[PDB]
Structures are given as C-alpha cells and as structure tokens.
Design a binder for these strands. Structure first.
Ligand SMILES: [Mg+2]
Ligand SMILES: [Mg+2]
Ligand SMILES: [Mg+2]
Ligand SMILES: [Mg+2]
Ligand SMILES: [Mg+2]
Ligand SMILES: [Mg+2]
Ligand SMILES: [Mg+2]
Ligand SMILES: [Mg+2]
Ligand SMILES: [Mg+2]
Ligand SMILES: [Mg+2]
Ligand SMILES: [Mg+2]
Ligand SMILES: [Mg+2]
Ligand SMILES: [Mg+2]
Ligand SMILES: [Mg+2]
Ligand SMILES: [Mg+2]
Ligand SMILES: [Zn+2]
Lengths: 74, 81, 71, 103, 213, 135, 39
RNA sequence: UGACAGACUGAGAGCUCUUUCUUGAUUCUAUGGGUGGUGGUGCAUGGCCGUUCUUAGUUGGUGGAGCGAUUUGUCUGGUUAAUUCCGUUAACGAACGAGACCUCAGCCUGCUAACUAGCUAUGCGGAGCCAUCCCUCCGCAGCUAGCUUCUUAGAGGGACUAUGGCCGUUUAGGCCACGGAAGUUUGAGGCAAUAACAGGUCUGUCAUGCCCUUAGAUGUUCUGGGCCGCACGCGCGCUACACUGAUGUAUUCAACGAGUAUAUAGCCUUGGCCGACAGGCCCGGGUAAUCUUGGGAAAUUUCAUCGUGAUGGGGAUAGAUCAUUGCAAUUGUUGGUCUUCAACGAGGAAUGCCUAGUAAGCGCGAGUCAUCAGCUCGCGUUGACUACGUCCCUGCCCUUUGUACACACCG
C-alpha cells in the first residue's frame, strides 16, 4: 500500500526477505536463519535494512528542495 | 443631520437601560444589531454626545464602543424619568 | 565537527571532580549515573557529556590529568 | 438504563491535553465503567504561509505559521447522570469537551 | 454548528480582539493580558491589571459596562459572560505593564534618561534576570536615533526566547513625531511556576552535592 | 482465475468473448467520438467499444460501488493544453455510461442500492471461465 | 466588498479559515491568535 | 425636509426648474474648530522587513600599557562547521552570537490504546475447480482475539565518535573499520548578536509630525473608460524543436492539504440519469481518520499506428459555433467542437542553479477565487552524471604590512 511503482517493488523485496528471515528465526532455527541472513547480506544489505531516504522538503526561494530560481542582475 | 423624535427616543430608551452601545463601521446596513436605525444616526448622534462628552469613547478599530458617563445619565434623566 | 563546547567540558570535569568511585568506564552506566546525580534539559546533552566523561575515565585511569582534583 | 455515551475532546497543546485524557480515564476507572480510549486521532495541521515583508521589497522571504489541533475520543457505557458525576472534575485551560449521547 | 478548525481559529481571533480592544480602556491601569476559560453554562474572562478600584470604577460599575458591551458585541447568551479584573501577582516583570508605565512617564515630560532607568531599576529590583529598553525616534532632535539601554542577562536565539523573553512594543503620541518603545524582560527559573516559568533554560547544569554515608 | 491471468491477455480474451458470446445493442455514435476531451484522435482499433467494455468488466469485478464518475476519473489522462502546462483531465461520460448500460443489459453488472455498480454472480462465472481459458 | 477585520483594507487578505485579515495584520496579531511558528 | 407628473440628464439621482403638498425647530446662514484623504514628504518617523553577513562576530566591570584617541582580555601554535576547544598568556572573571534550544523526517514485531484505522480467524454466503468436502479470490457480520505488525498519536528508548586501528604535544581532535536505522552536529528548517543603510514601506493599519486639500472637495457614492494600450529593449517563466518520440488502446502507484446557514440542500461533491462534448436534472452524504478520497495523478509500463518528411514534432495565429461563472464577458473571463498548421533543425557574445532521494523529468493540493494559475507556496513519483577538491575567477573572516583614503578606491 502506498508509494509509487519501483518503491513498491523494492518494498516487496525487503518484505519477503525479512519475512523469510523472521519465519526461520522464530519457527525453524537461529542457525538455520543465519544462513539466510548471510546469503541475503552478502549480495546486498538493503534487503534487510530500511532505507532512511525521504524526499526532503522544498524551501522558498526556488522550485525544488535544493535549487533556486535563476538569478538576474541586469 | 436628520433624526426623528421617535428615532432619538428609541436611542434614549435604549441608552437609559444599557449605558453602553457599540456601532460598526460596516456602513449602509439600515439595521444596527439590537436597534433599528440606518447606522448613520448611531455613529453621529453619539459623535455629538462625545462632542458634548456625555459619553466617553474608545475607538477599538472601527468597532465603535461607547460607554456612557454619569454626566450623560443626568442628561437623559433630564429627558425621560 | 564534533568538538565539545564549554557547557559540556566544564560540566564533565566538574562532575568527575565529585563523583569518581561512583561512576565507571561504561558509557551507558555513566548515562544512568548522571541521571540520578545531575539535572539537565536534553537527552542529547546528557549523552554528549556522558560520552566525554567516559574517555575522561579512559585517560585518568592510566595516567595523571590536568586541574581536576580528587582526594 | 445503562446507555452508551461519546466524549470528544480537542485542544491546541499536547501536554495540556494528555493531562485531561489521564484525568477522565482514571475518573471512569475509579468507578468501574466500561470505557474504551483514549483513541488518538490524527493531528490537524492548520497552516498559513505569508510574505513576512509588509511592502514587498528585498529578497522574497516567507514564514510558515501553523496550529496543531489535536482530537481525542472516548466511549463510556454509563448513564448521562453518572457521566455528569465524573465530568464535574476540574478541566484544564484550553481543552474542549463535547459529550454527546450516541446509539 | 461549525467545524473544529474554524472554531479554534475563531476563538483565537476572538482572543485577539479582546486583548487588542481592552488596550484603549485599560491603558491607564496597566492592562497586562486576558485569559479566556471555558466553564459550564457560563463564560469566564480573567482580565489582569494593576488597579481594581480603577478598573472596576465605583462599586463595580465599569466592569459591568465592559462585560455588557462584550456581551452585546460578541452576541453571547445573556448572563453567559462576565469579567473579573484580578491583580497581577507581580508587576515588575510584565513587559506590557512596563510599556505603558514608561509611556506615561514619557508623556508626562520626564526626561528620557530618568524615565528609562526608572524602568530599568524597577524591573531589576523586581528580581528580573535581565532587561533592556530600546527607544527609537526623534527625541530632542530632528534626525531620528535609537537609545538602547541594557542590564543583566539576556537570550535572543533559539526556542527559550518564547519561554523567557517577555517583550512588548508600543507607540507614543508626543508632538513632532512618534517615539517607539521596545521592552524585553528575561525571566528567571521558578520551578513552582507562580512567578517564573517552570522549565529551566537549557544551558544550566546543577551537579547535586554528594551527601555522605 | 482472473487475478491469476495476465491483466492484458484477459482483456483481449474477454473482448473477443463479448463478441462471439452472443450480441447486444450498440449506439450509432461509436465510430465518431474521441472518448475523452483531451484525446486527439478516436481509437485506432475498430472494436475499441469492446476492449473498453472488457476493461470496465474487470473494474467492477475487482472493485465495488463504482459510479460513472469513478470511470470518468479512471479513464482520464494527461491533457496537453498547448503552451499551457499539462494537467489531469477526466474522460467522457457517455462512453462509460453505455458500456455500463450494455453490461447491465447482459446482466454482467448491475446498479446496487447505496449507489454504485456491482458484479452479479453469473457475470462472475463468465469472467472466471474466460480467465481460466487463457494460457 | 471584503476587508480586514483588523485594518479594513482591500488587499493582501487571508480568506482561508475565515480570518478576514490581511497578510500584514495577520502577522502583527499572529502569535496571540495562536499560530505558533514551529517552522 | 422628501416628493407625483413633464422637461434636463443613462438614470426608476425630485440635482435644477412649472406644481402646491408633506416633515417640523432635527435644520439653514455666518465665525472658529475638527473631521475625512491609496494627496506630498520613508530625507521628520514608529513598527515591520531586507541587506551588510550564513560568515563568526560583538560589548562591559576591575586590572596592565599609553599624555591621548585607543589597545590588552578577544592570543603564538594545534584543532573545529564556529571567538569550537586544547593550550599559551597582564590579565582575571564574565555578557551576548556559535553551540545548546524547538519543529518535521528517519529506527522501535518494546509500552498506551483505537468499530471515524487495519490486520488475523472463524461463520455463512458468491465464483473457479478429484465438485463432496478441500484449495484460490472476493462480499457481509459479530462476546473473535490471551490483536496492534501495517495506520494514527502519546510517552518514552536510541548516537555518544560509544567501540577498535592509525596520526596528533598522544591534549584538543582528525582519517579509517566492525556494529548499528542513523558515524558531513544523522538530514532539512525555525529562531538568531553589536553597529549600520538616509535600503523598502506615509499605498497594511482611527501609527503618525509638518505641509496641501476640506463642499464648486484630492473627502464618500454611482456610470463609462483606463491599469491589458504597441515600432521596440530587458527579466522570471511555459511549450517545444521529436523515434530515449508522438498518437491510440490495455495496465495501476502516492503524499501534502481543502470543504461559513453556503435557503429551502448549500461550500467539497459521491450515486443514478441526458448529452459526443461542454455541461444539465434527481436522490442525497460530510462542520469531517465518518462523505468526498481507503485521493483510481501523471511520468513511467505494455501492444499496435506513424518511419527522418518542418511528418502524425510544434501548437503560435485566425474563422465558425456551443455551455457554464457572473447583475454585467466588448479589447475574445473560462471550457468545449471542427477548421486555420506559423517560427522553431538544440540556439552567438555571454550567464544562472545544483553535491543525495539532491539536479532534472512528472503530476497533485493550497494561496489568489463568483470564474480566470503559465505564478508562488507546500506535497509526493521516477531518479542520476560529477566532486569529496582549490583560492584561479567573484566574494567572506582573521593576522601582518602600506596608505597623501574616512561620503573610506565608486577614495
Ligand atoms: Mg524604517
Ligand atoms: Mg582601564
Ligand atoms: Mg593611565
Ligand atoms: Mg580595559
Ligand atoms: Mg541543524
Ligand atoms: Mg530609510
Ligand atoms: Mg467607479
Ligand atoms: Mg500591471
Ligand atoms: Mg522570480
Ligand atoms: Mg501533435
Ligand atoms: Mg488555482
Ligand atoms: Mg502573482
Ligand atoms: Mg557567478
Ligand atoms: Mg581627509
Ligand atoms: Mg580609481
Ligand atoms: Zn489588515
């Protein structure tokens, strides 16, 4: 729910990865889930750790959160 | 100005009872809240009573609050009582 | 860009003056030590001063130290 | 005899508001009512953005003003006179309460 | 019936209207603020000022006048609202009170220096951690100038400004110009909250003494 | 079923299905309209009145209580105002109206009390069968 | 036909929430209305 | 004092006139004085705001030096985003600014709860089916939770360079590595010092001094026009110059917010119907996590159509006509429909903005608003190249030095 398109897909990725790890940890074995932990994290860390990036807000004096308006002297 | 004695009487009967009166700068209403008058007499007869300082006045940003004085109660008692 | 200001360092030295045997090396233990022995107005300043006092420990415990005086 | 009542309760300040929330919950639970709450309902953020200059000179500078209006709702199962037995305790400044009789 | 956003905005505006309007009436009494409290079947407005028998008048006639005019202007239910005019607990820390006090000392013709330090010494003897008075305008000369007078502690940036800085601005209607007054008072930490604000300024540490056993 | 079938091929299969599975009435303005104000040409396909209906079939399938305006909005798009900045523009009313009326006339969908359009059970049967008959 | 409640002028109004005050009067009285400026 | 009729004038302004009726001490006349002014003066000013100046800077008390303006403290050096700190020290001890502070965002399977939030299970229903049950997906309800992970919002917790290595007087710190959600104070803002400007604002203000005006008015109201005029020059922008595209189907994903008694349903408008559209009719819902909207946004994705052509790029211009807002649409308010199909081949000299969910692309909401959003402020969606530097250009801060400058090199 929510997001865009690629955001939702990467959220799928994270959700299924963490769901498999949590299911294994609580219902299989901690050493068993540790292999899943290492397979996932060796390829990438972003499967398991949320990404703290957000569209940071837009400030006055420009259209854009970091740019400004084109500036004229004469 | 033009005023009817009945207009000025419904002013005096109202002021004797209340002692305060508020106008509004919203002009051309023909019906002040709580009395019946075209809002020109409300502003300007109490302007006259301020000129005679029977009523002392605080302007309050086009809200025109007036509260009558013990001199003006004598003025109106000299009329109706 | 992490240099501690005087409100930090003065307080760290002053608290380490008085409370030595009652506070230790571990950062989190010093946090909770400082909770009962001082009143501050921000958890981040609390963490800041506790984290300065902890390496004040790690320097005192091995050699002598400047003005701060302990019986 | 035992009916269902709503109390809705809003404010501007969280620290003021939560004191009232704990107030009514304990007022009910001293007398063992069937309560559920205090449901916390998403904060309204009133906002007005204004050019802080009064004449329109100098670099364009805006300032963003905002109120935060906080909404709380609690359900009680008691008679309205039993409710008035509770809701005569002191009410903190600024908070508003709007008890209503529901289905 | 109205929405809550609108109700809260309207009550803010109503508060603004009283707090502004009462300035012409209670100027020569040290008006300092009003607080509007919501009470059952009744409406309460605590004006706070410096003279009860002058705000009340004689046998509470003037507060009758004002409560009636507020009644009638803001169309309350009759006997709904009435106003008590209670005394400020302390008068030397109310920036508004000082603003109109200096306004009267300065309309009276009192010299600028004597008046301004009359404000400063009074504020300090009233136990204020710090104060400044800024006067701007055409005093005794044509080209405008600012006389700034300071004393004691003072904070000006960050959040605790709203917490501690009691600041007012007023105009003076002396001939050949207008003379503006700014009065800033820094408050002291009274955790009881009766006089000074409860929460302390966030540049303070109080290491407690080591009680011994 | 239809949630298992690729969302495009189900539309194709059902578009052929409501061609060969009997027939109905059809307005005599279908080969004129643009189906939306921001469009520029009428649909390049001939049986667009049928692919449209196949799509709007599964809309009421997988969502309930949809009005005509909901379809106007769902079938709007980007309107290029010329030199103005482009915007979002809702689609046409009559085209969706006659799709819904046609499907109602076959009883696939029907107007619900409390408002909206909901599928019927035998329409559900039909959509599930045609979904199952796709690779 | 519409002005400030405060100054009664015809520009710079803030119609939103029904204030009926201009951008200047609004700031001048903003803090007592309650528009705490957290950011 | 108001007015019938007729002339006058748009005027259904009795303003004036022919006409005699009505009100009655309210007036009218004259002298003063005020009142009102988006009139002048921002070079008389208050306030507010901007800027100097986003940098780290500033001022006392006592003491030292100097006849004195003044200087020291406020620094040799190291370090830091920082007058940040270590330390040095005729200074000592302090006051602001920095930091600290507050707001938003990011972490919490930890706590408080939530039929105006949502899972989860079962109970039936509907449809697919080794159909008889099961299994998959939807619908509805509850004394279903020994439900709060998703949603909300409170209290809290969390980061401290804490841990390790190396450099550094092994001080201040820096660079690196594990861990961790977070190791440019974690990201972005709010607030923000002394001194100043003849910076802007007398057109925000019953804020204002002085002048001018004050009835035949620069006062107030109305009508019509004007602010939009166009040989032209400049500034911020929008649309493009296409194939990484346009067109036409199919596919489906947010966030920020918004919604006066608005009268006889009325601001957001769901739903049914008519219409190609535009937009109309009827039932209604919502003062709101309740109805709008669980925002069904676009870009993008997919399948075809156009195939290098000023073409189906482009939508400038102009004609015909239709409906809504409005008491009024003309110098077309706006929105449709058909047609008209311009320049524009990636833009000279020059110049601007930008270092991570950032630039850029894409849409939404709000402000204005009866209608008009190419603008401004917010919001999310997709999402990078480059660098992690230097004082070369433009500027800033400190120290030293030079000065015939002080309105200060525009000397
Ligand atoms: Mg100024
Ligand atoms: Mg000396
Ligand atoms: Mg000497
Ligand atoms: Mg000295
Ligand atoms: Mg910061
Ligand atoms: Mg100036
Ligand atoms: Mg006119
Ligand atoms: Mg113009
Ligand atoms: Mg611009
Ligand atoms: Mg085209
Ligand atoms: Mg708009
Ligand atoms: Mg504009
Ligand atoms: Mg440049
Ligand atoms: Mg010279
Ligand atoms: Mg030269
Ligand atoms: Zn205003």
């Amino acid at each position: 729910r929510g997001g865009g398109k690629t955001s939702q897909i990467y959220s799928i990725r994270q959700a299924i990865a963490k769901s498999l790890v949590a299911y294994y940890q609580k219902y299989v074995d901690e050493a068993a889930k540790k292999e899943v932990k290492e397979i996932f994290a060796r390829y990438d860390r972003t499967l398991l750790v949320a990404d703290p990036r957000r569209c940071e807000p837009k400030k006055f004096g420009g259209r854009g959160a970091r740019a400004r308006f084109q500036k004229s002297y004469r | 100005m033009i005023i009817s004695k009945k207009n000025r009487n419904e002013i005096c009967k109202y002021l004797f009872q209340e002692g305060v009166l508020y106008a509004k700068k919203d002009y051309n209403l023909a019906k002040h809240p709580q009395i019946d008058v075209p809002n020109l007499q409300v502003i300007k007869l109490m302007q006259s009573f301020k000129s005679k300082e029977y009523v002392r006045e605080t302007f309050s940003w086009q809200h025109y609050y007036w509260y009558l004085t013990n001199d003006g109660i004598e003025f109106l008692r000299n009329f109706l009582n | 860009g992490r240099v501690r200001t005087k409100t930090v360092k003065k307080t760290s030295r002053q608290v380490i003056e008085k409370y030595y045997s009652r506070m230790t090396l571990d950062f989190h233990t010093n946090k909770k030590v400082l909770e009962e022995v001082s009143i501050l107005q921000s958890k981040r300043l609390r963490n800041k001063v506790a984290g300065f006092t902890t390496h004040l420990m790690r320097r005192i415990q091995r050699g002598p130290v400047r003005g701060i005086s302990l019986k | 005899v035992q009916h269902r009542i709503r109390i809705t309760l809003s404010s501007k300040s969280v620290k003021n508001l939560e004191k009232v929330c704990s107030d009514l919950v304990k007022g009910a639970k001293e007398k063992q009512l069937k309560v559920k709450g205090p449901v916390r309902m998403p904060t309204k953020v009133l906002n007005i953005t204004t050019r802080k200059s009064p004449c329109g000179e100098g670099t364009n500078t805006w300032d963003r003003f905002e109120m935060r209006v906080h909404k709380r709702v609690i359900d009680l199962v008691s008679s309205p006179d039993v409710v008035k037995q509770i809701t005569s305790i002191t009410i903190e400044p600024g908070v508003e309460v709007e008890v209503t009789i529901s289905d | 019936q109205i929405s809550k956003k609108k109700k809260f905005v309207s009550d803010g505006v109503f508060y603004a209207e009283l707090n502004e309007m009462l300035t012409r009436e209670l100027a020569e009494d040290g008006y300092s603020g009003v607080e509007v409290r919501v009470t059952p079947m009744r409406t309460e407005i605590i004006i706070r000022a410096t003279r009860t028998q002058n705000v009340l008048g004689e046998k509470g006639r003037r507060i009758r006048e004002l409560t009636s005019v507020v009644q009638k202007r803001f169309n309350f239910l009759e006997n709904g609202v009435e106003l008590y005019a209670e005394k400020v607990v302390n008068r030397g820390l109310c920036a508004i009170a000082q603003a109109e006090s200096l306004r009267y000392k300065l309309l009276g013709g009192l010299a600028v220096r004597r008046a301004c330090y009359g404000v400063l010494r009074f504020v300090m003897e009233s136990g204020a951690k710090g104060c400044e008075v800024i006067v701007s305008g055409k005093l005794r000369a044509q080209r405008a100038k600012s006389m700034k007078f300071k004393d004691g502690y003072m904070i000006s940036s960050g959040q605790p400004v709203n917490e501690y800085i009691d600041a007012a601005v007023r105009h003076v209607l002396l001939r050949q110009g207008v003379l503006g007054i700014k009065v800033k008072i820094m408050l002291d930490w009274d955790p009881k909250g009766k006089l000074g604000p409860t929460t302390p300024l966030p540049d303070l540490v109080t290491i407690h003494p080591p009680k011994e056993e | 079923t239809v949630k298992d079938v690729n969302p495009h091929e189900f539309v194709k299969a059902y578009s052929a299905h409501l061609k060969r599975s009997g027939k109905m009435e059809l307005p005599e303005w279908v080969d004129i309209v643009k189906t939306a104000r921001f469009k520029e040409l009428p649909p390049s396909d001939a049986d667009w009145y049928y692919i449209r209906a196949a799509s709007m079939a599964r809309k009421i399938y997988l969502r309930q209580g949809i009005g005509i305006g909901g379809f106007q909005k769902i079938y709007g798009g980007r309107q290029r105002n010329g030199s103005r900045p482009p915007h979002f523009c809702k689609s046409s009313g009559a085209v969706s109206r006659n799709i819904l009326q046609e499907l109602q006339k076959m009883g696939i969908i029907d107007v619900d009390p409390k408002g909206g359009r909901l599928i019927t059970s035998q329409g559900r049967r039909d959509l599930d069968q045609v979904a199952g008959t796709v690779p | 036909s519409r002005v400030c409640r405060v100054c009664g002028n015809s520009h710079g109004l803030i119609r939103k929430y029904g204030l009926m005050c201009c951008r200047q009067c609004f700031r001048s009285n903003a803090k007592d209305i309650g528009f705490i400026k957290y950011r």
